[PDB]
Nucleic acid binder design. Structure first.
Ligand SMILES: [Zn+2]
Ligand SMILES: [Zn+2]
Ligand SMILES: [Zn+2]
Ligand SMILES: [Zn+2]
Lengths: 78, 78
DNA sequence: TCGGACAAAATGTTCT
DNA sequence: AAGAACATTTTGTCCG
């Protein structure tokens, strides 16, 4: 299937969302680093397999908007 | 006479013909030496500043060329 | 699914 | 100034 963030091949539902392993780990690192990324464009960068490295701000924004959340399994269990 | 012409960080000298910081110097060398088949995720006018210069190597390399960076600056100069 | 360990890629600094 | 070595950061895969 397809990662909902970067369109690469997805490796499961991570943190609530069908995503590839690279996006899974990017997301956990972003949340736990509480990094404050800034876009160099217009907050609408193309995030695909090549370009996902280019804008961590837009990649992270796509993660969050797709509904990724570290407590996804904890919420869904409930 | 103080600022990197590519990213606006503090320049360290006049490298490959242009006033630049050390990071832009070696970024340009690596880009020319090798391949630079970079892809912009924006509209080819990414802002290249001290933080964001890492986001888009395509626009960073474009700004190096536009500023006139070239490997044989010192030969050409002589 | 999740995350630790390891590895690769990409970037940046020292040069006593 | 330019470049090799060294070093760090950022990203991605392998395992369990
Ligand atoms: Zn992805
Ligand atoms: Zn962006
Ligand atoms: Zn610079
Ligand atoms: Zn760009």
């Amino acid at each position: 299937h397809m990662c909902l963030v970067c369109s690469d091949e997805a490796s499961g539902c991570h943190y609530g969302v069908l995503t590839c392993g690279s996006c899974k780990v990017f997301f956990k690192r972003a949340v736990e680093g509480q990094h404050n990324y800034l876009c160099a464009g217009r907050n609408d960068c193309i995030i695909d397999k090549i370009r996902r490295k280019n804008c961590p701000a837009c990649r992270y924004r796509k993660c969050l908007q797709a509904g990724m959340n570290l407590e996804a399994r904890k919420t869904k269990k409930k």
